[PDB]
Amino acid sequence: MAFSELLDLVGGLGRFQVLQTMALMVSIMWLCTQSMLENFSAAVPSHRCWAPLLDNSTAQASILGSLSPEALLAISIPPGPNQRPHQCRRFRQPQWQLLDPNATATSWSEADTEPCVDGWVYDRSIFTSTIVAKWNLVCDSHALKPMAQSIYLAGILVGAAACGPASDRFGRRLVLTWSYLQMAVMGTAAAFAPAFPVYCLFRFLLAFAVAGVMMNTGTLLMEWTAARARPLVMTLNSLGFSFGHGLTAAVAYGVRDWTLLQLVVSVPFFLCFLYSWWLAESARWLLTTGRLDWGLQELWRVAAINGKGAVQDTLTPEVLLSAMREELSASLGTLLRMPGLRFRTCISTLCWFAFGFTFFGLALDLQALGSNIFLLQMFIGVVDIPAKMGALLLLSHLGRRPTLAASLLLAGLCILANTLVPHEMGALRSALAVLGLGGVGAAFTCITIYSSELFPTVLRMTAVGLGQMAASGGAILGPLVRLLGVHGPWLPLLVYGTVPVLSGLAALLLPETQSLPLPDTIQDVQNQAVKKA
């Protein structure tokens, strides 16, 4: 007996599936808020050295001559790039001669400057407080922000590496519930963190739980949803990220203190943990692992919730044990040791890498459209939505492989086409970038579904976990390839364009799905391979 007939008996569509889909989409939305928080909480405000004559009322009172704040700024801080105050240098002594209109802006020497010994004054008009303002992550410490992002993404990688095998061994509900609890507690502790390294530690452990939530949410959605409804529910889950982006912009717009923002974003996950006790674990995994009694209890619970109580008399434990007795009659190394699965795993991980690579590769044009980070994040979410819906329709009509390939090809072609557009002729760059990012979102929906369908239940979470680590590896490598950008302006765009085209071409080397039974066992994958011949 396959799981599909058991699901049809219990009712593979109903109030249970709707409630689980909405609850998990809401949790994915808040997880997105946790993921982009550092886009906002670690924004770098405009800053200058602290200067006595500007910022110490007592030193201002010692001047018998009134000066305007602009004059005090000119005399206290050298002009930096774009005629703004220099972010990293001050005058050792105030150069009052620079207020005289008969003076060139170069009438001073580097010997007249010293570092900001007394710290920095941050502009608080937009953000009341940031981690950058809290720990002075500017100038010499400017590298700590992308370092914090790299630590977070390494947390995602380690989370995927641990939570994959843990999900395969212990079950999806248990790992999901603990991931919600760990994320909620550690994120609250991050909100109350005294020092930046402690903040980085809590952010790493939060990202570990973020990986656990993302994987187990996707797994539960595919395993409880009937095959006909599976694309729609997975698309809704993928739209959860785009709505999470819009929610992120709205919440950060209302609460501009990073501590309060971290708290407001962490508190809903305690409620998510509390209702997450109500979620059903995957019946399919329970059946393939021989845990018939627990699988039965969960199937009866879902049948009761679906109003199909009359199926209780036909589902006896003897019939189920006999049916799995007939069907029956892990470690990443198992995935890499089995020849038919090795190639599929490698190509899936390559497509995940291409996703992570392409997002940060194309994320430079969005900067050209304007300034309000809240509006820009919202517009990213808004344009990400119809691309995902179109992807879902093409996934329903054309299947998983050509839609994924077309999305990766479109992304790579958009970045390469962006290479030929002159820098002066803007807006065309923005249009191509928005279409590109929409294609990347479509590619994300395609690769999440197709990766979830390619691998058998016993190995599915380990393979999805490996994919997620590869995606985080790409995300980590992106910015560093921008550091490779110093060795000529064409190298980063060439790499960011070549990775997704090559990944889409490699993605064409995959077996077509959407009309195959979902693989429960490794043996199911072999039967698909023999049928492919």
DSSP per position, 223-243: HHS-TTTHHHHHHHHHHHHHH
Please tell me the distance from the alpha carbon of residue 93 to that of residue 91, in angstroms, as a whole number. 5
Strands 90-91, 47-49: pairing kind: unpaired
Strand ranges, E, within 320-425: none
Backbone angles phi, psi at 121, to 5 degrees: -105, 120
Q: For the chain, after which residues does the C atom lie more than 2.5 Å from the next written residue's N, i.e. where is it broken? A: 329
Pair of tokens at residue 371: 């300034």
Pair of tokens at residue 515: 């009309």
Please tell me the distance from the alpha carbon of residue 265 to that of residue 272, in angstroms, as a whole number. 12
CATH ID of 1-45+133-226+256-329, from 1.10.760.10, 1.20.1250.20, 2.60.120.10, 3.40.190.10: 1.20.1250.20
Q: What value, to the nearest 5°, has the Cα angle with vertex 386 and ends 382 and 387?
A: 105
263 within 8 A of 184, measured Cβ to Cβ: no
> In the chain, where are the structural domains located?
1-45+133-226+256-329, 47-122, 330-524
Identify any residues that bridge with 113 across adjacent strands, giving them in sequence order.
91
281 within 8 A of 20, measured Cβ to Cβ: no
Please tell me the distance from the alpha carbon of residue 476 to that of residue 151, in angstroms, as a whole number. 9
Classify residue 200 by burial, with Cβ atoms within 10 Å: 0-12, 13-18, 19+: buried
Of the candidates 463, 517, 500, 414, the residue with the CA atom closest to the CA atom of residue 165: 463
Please tell me the distance from the alpha carbon of residue 117 to that of residue 122, in angstroms, as a whole number. 15
For CA atoms 463, 466, 470, 472, the dihedral sign is positive
Classify residue 531 by burial, with Cβ atoms within 10 Å: 0-12, 13-18, 19+: exposed
Burial 472-491 (b: 16+ CB within 10 A, else e): bbbbbbbbebbeeeeeeeee
Q: Which amino acid would we find at residue 310?
A: A
Pair of tokens at residue 295: 């699988």
Of the candidates 337, 351, 349, 346, the residue with the CA atom closest to the CA atom of residue 522: 337
Please tell me the distance from the alpha carbon of residue 81 to that of residue 388, in angstroms, as a whole number. 41
Classify residue 260 by burial, with Cβ atoms within 10 Å: 0-12, 13-18, 19+: middle
82 within 8 A of 101, measured Cβ to Cβ: no
* Residue 279, number of CB atoms within 10 A of its CB: 21
Of the candidates 203, 211, 158, the residue with the CA atom closest to the CA atom of residue 180: 211
Pair of tokens at residue 85: 């105050």
Pair of tokens at residue 488: 């000529």
Place of tokens 């209890």: 297
With residue 47 as reference, give the H or E element that holds it.
Answer: strand 47-49
Pair of tokens at residue 222: 């595919």
Pair of tokens at residue 21: 């889909």
CA distances from 156 to 149, 245, 465 (A): 11, 18, 10
Backbone angles phi, psi at 37, to 5 degrees: -55, -40
305 within 8 A of 14, measured Cβ to Cβ: yes
Cα-Cα end-to-end distance for the chain: 24
Integer-rounded Cα Rg, in Å, for the chain is 27
480 within 8 A of 357, measured Cβ to Cβ: no
Specify the DSSP class assigned to residue 85.
B
Please tell me the distance from the alpha carbon of residue 460 to that of residue 520, in angstroms, as a whole number. 9
* Residue 434, number of CB atoms within 10 A of its CB: 21
Of the candidates 406, 473, 397, 472, the residue with the CA atom closest to the CA atom of residue 438: 406
Please tell me the distance from the alpha carbon of residue 297 to that of residue 318, in angstroms, as a whole number. 14
428 within 8 A of 194, measured Cβ to Cβ: no
Please tell me the distance from the alpha carbon of residue 450 to that of residue 453, in angstroms, as a whole number. 5
Strands 113-114, 90-91: pairing kind: antiparallel
**Quoted resolution (Å):** 3.0
Identify any residues that bridge with 129 across adjacent strands, giving them in sequence order.
257
Q: Which amino acid would we find at residue 140?
A: D
Specify the DSSP class assigned to residue 48.
E
Of the candidates 145, 166, 171, 156, the residue with the CA atom closest to the CA atom of residue 31: 156
376 within 8 A of 511, measured Cβ to Cβ: no
Helix 400-420 to helix 491-507 angle, to the nearest 10 degrees? 160
Please tell me the distance from the alpha carbon of residue 87 to that of residue 123, in angstroms, as a whole number. 12
Place of tokens 């009052």: 96
- Identify how the structure was determined: cryo-EM
Give the CATH fold of the 330-524 domain.
Growth Hormone; Chain: A; (1.20.1250)
243 within 8 A of 31, measured Cβ to Cβ: no
| Alpha helix (H) residue ranges in 192-229 | 196-224
Place of tokens 């809903």: 268
Burial 50-83 (b: 16+ CB within 10 A, else e): bbebbbeeeeeeeeeeebeeeebbbbbbbeeeee
Contacts of 12 (CB under 8 A, 6+ apart): 4, 224, 225, 226, 229
Pair of tokens at residue 144: 């700590």
